[PDB]
Scaffold this motif. Structure first.
Motif, PDB file in Angstrom:
ATOM      1  N   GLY A  52       0.787  -1.245   0.000  1.00  0.00           N
ATOM      2  CA  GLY A  52       0.000   0.000   0.000  1.00  0.00           C
ATOM      3  C   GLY A  52       0.815   1.290   0.000  1.00  0.00           C
ATOM      4  N   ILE A  53       1.771   1.400  -0.912  1.00  0.00           N
ATOM      5  CA  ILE A  53       2.578   2.616  -1.041  1.00  0.00           C
ATOM      6  C   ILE A  53       1.966   3.436  -2.178  1.00  0.00           C
ATOM      7  N   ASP A  54       1.679   4.706  -1.922  1.00  0.00           N
ATOM      8  CA  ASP A  54       1.167   5.606  -2.955  1.00  0.00           C
ATOM      9  C   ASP A  54       2.256   5.836  -3.998  1.00  0.00           C
ATOM     10  N   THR A  55       1.927   5.661  -5.268  1.00  0.00           N
ATOM     11  CA  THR A  55       2.945   5.790  -6.315  1.00  0.00           C
ATOM     12  C   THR A  55       2.693   6.969  -7.264  1.00  0.00           C
ATOM     13  N   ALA A  56       1.779   7.869  -6.909  1.00  0.00           N
ATOM     14  CA  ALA A  56       1.437   8.986  -7.799  1.00  0.00           C
ATOM     15  C   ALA A  56       2.672   9.836  -8.151  1.00  0.00           C
ATOM     16  N   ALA A  57       3.631   9.933  -7.235  1.00  0.00           N
ATOM     17  CA  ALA A  57       4.784  10.807  -7.447  1.00  0.00           C
ATOM     18  C   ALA A  57       5.846  10.205  -8.362  1.00  0.00           C
ATOM     19  N   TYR A  58       5.652   8.973  -8.853  1.00  0.00           N
ATOM     20  CA  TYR A  58       6.704   8.285  -9.628  1.00  0.00           C
ATOM     21  C   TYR A  58       6.223   7.856 -11.026  1.00  0.00           C
ATOM     22  N   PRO A  59       5.881   8.824 -11.879  1.00  0.00           N
ATOM     23  CA  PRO A  59       5.297   8.470 -13.192  1.00  0.00           C
ATOM     24  C   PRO A  59       6.224   7.741 -14.162  1.00  0.00           C
ATOM     25  N   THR A  60       7.526   8.019 -14.106  1.00  0.00           N
ATOM     26  CA  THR A  60       8.479   7.286 -14.932  1.00  0.00           C
ATOM     27  C   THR A  60       8.619   5.834 -14.489  1.00  0.00           C
ATOM     28  N   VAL A  61       8.703   5.626 -13.177  1.00  0.00           N
ATOM     29  CA  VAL A  61       8.728   4.290 -12.604  1.00  0.00           C
ATOM     30  C   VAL A  61       7.449   3.537 -12.995  1.00  0.00           C
ATOM     31  N   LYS A  62       6.316   4.229 -12.946  1.00  0.00           N
ATOM     32  CA  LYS A  62       5.035   3.627 -13.343  1.00  0.00           C
ATOM     33  C   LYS A  62       5.038   3.210 -14.818  1.00  0.00           C
ATOM     34  N   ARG A  63       5.455   4.121 -15.697  1.00  0.00           N
ATOM     35  CA  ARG A  63       5.482   3.837 -17.126  1.00  0.00           C
ATOM     36  C   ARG A  63       6.307   2.584 -17.423  1.00  0.00           C
TER      37      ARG A  63
END
Ligand SMILES: N[C@@H](CCC(=O)N[C@@H](CS)C(=O)NCC(=O)O)C(=O)O
Ligand SMILES: N[C@@H](CCC(=O)N[C@@H](CS)C(=O)NCC(=O)O)C(=O)O
Lengths: 216, 214
Positions: free
Chosen positions: A181-192
């Motif tokens: 349950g870690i919020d990942t909104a701040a990491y868009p490159t990691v997400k992509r």
């Protein structure tokens, strides 16, 4: 006959190895330990890996291999068909550095033995223990986001346009953000990049939630 | 070669040993990690992690992570090999290295010690229980593996120094610095003394670096 891995459904380290085996087309059998019930502390398993951790891997005759990064390099050196490192040394070193941000400086801070030590040694409740785990995740994710977004080497994947050890480690962290349950909104490159990696059959088949012992 | 380092740093020590063993000249820039030099914007521009070592090799971008750097030096320079030729032996050497570099060392670096004290309000002595447990856990694993596995020779893997030994000695020197009892790890001690007897290693020792105590 075939490669045998001692693993666990949830383990990020076992997931990294599982992905590599799939990507390279290596047939394997996996034995699933319960790391919450202490199967890793049983004498039979300590005979295999005195560290009392997974993964441990048998490749035919010979002693077992441990440590996910060492195993990834072993597979690279013994099954060369589908390379998971680039050829150029600076590119290799960057891929390994990114991998190690996760495998050295993030993941070892949130493994079960750490979680249980914080509770048992200091009397911390699970909720406060998790502040340590969350800090480890966020520290690693911020590092990765900065490096991947700003460094020239990033392409479709962490390093260029070919899957590497960096991506196997990155996705192993990413799946943990969902699990813990870690919020990942701040990491868009990691997400992509994580979503690019997860779209691969070899990776998806290896996903913790598809392994025996997983929750719904 | 230019390395951003620190006198006490175990990770910097690993790289420093390899540079000396391989006959690679280096400039080391010594950060003060108690003063927080590693958190300053200029350094974060070099390594967003705010950690050492970070290494520049000519004009390219900097390289971080001691194991990644060790492999880079292996691959781009001449000088004595620090990995064997055969894959099973390489994997074992790397696994022993990673017991330290992955599973032990990251648990006792300043950022973690500071987090324990600041986040939880732990007294220094209580925080040090975390550090001690990490050392002891790693030493027990290494002692059992090195004492029982056929791959061990004069050094961690066979009779030639490797990445395993560089990581092992980086832990060993910490036992003295943090006051960890080592009576229970005679194999680790034997190998560590073989490693320390190498002049390249002795030159690189944390306690012999600028910034170390008199
Ligand atoms: N750095 C090791 C990690 C080994 C490790 O600690 N793995 C965890 C699961 S991802 C484990 O089995 N822990 C058992 C425990 O904490 O008791 C690797 O890459 O294989
Ligand atoms: N896994 C990294 C570890 C890097 C690391 O943690 N370095 C320490 C010194 S040994 C550091 O600079 N820590 C900064 C801090 O804790 O604030 C590597 O092998 O290079």
């Amino acid at each position: 006959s075939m490669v045998k891995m001692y693993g666990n459904w949830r383990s990020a380290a076992a997931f990294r190895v599982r992905i590599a085996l799939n990507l390279k087309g290596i047939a394997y059998e996996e034995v699933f330990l319960d790391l919450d019930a202490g199967d890793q502390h049983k004498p039979d398993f300590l005979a295999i890996n005195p560290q009392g951790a997974v993964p441990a891997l048998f490749d035919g005759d010979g002693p077992p291999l441990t440590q996910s990064l060492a195993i990834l390099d072993y597979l690279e050196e013994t099954r060369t068909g589908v390379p998971l490192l680039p050829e150029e040394p600076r590119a290799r070193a960057r891929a390994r550095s990114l991998a190690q941000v996760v495998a050295c400086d993030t993941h070892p801070l949130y493994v079960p033995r750490v979680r249980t030590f914080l509770m048992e040694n200091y009397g911390l409740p699970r909720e406060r223990m998790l502040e340590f785990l969350r800090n480890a995740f966020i520290t690693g994710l911020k590092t990765l986001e900065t490096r991947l977004s700003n460094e020239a080497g990033t392409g479709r994947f962490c390093q260029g346009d070919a899957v590497s050890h960096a991506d196997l480690c990155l996705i192993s962290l990413w799946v943990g953000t969902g699990i813990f349950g870690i919020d990942t909104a701040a990491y868009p490159t990691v997400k992509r990049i994580s979503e690019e990696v997860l779209a691969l059959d070899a990776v998806a088949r290896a996903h913790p939630l598809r392994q025996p012992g997983a929750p719904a």
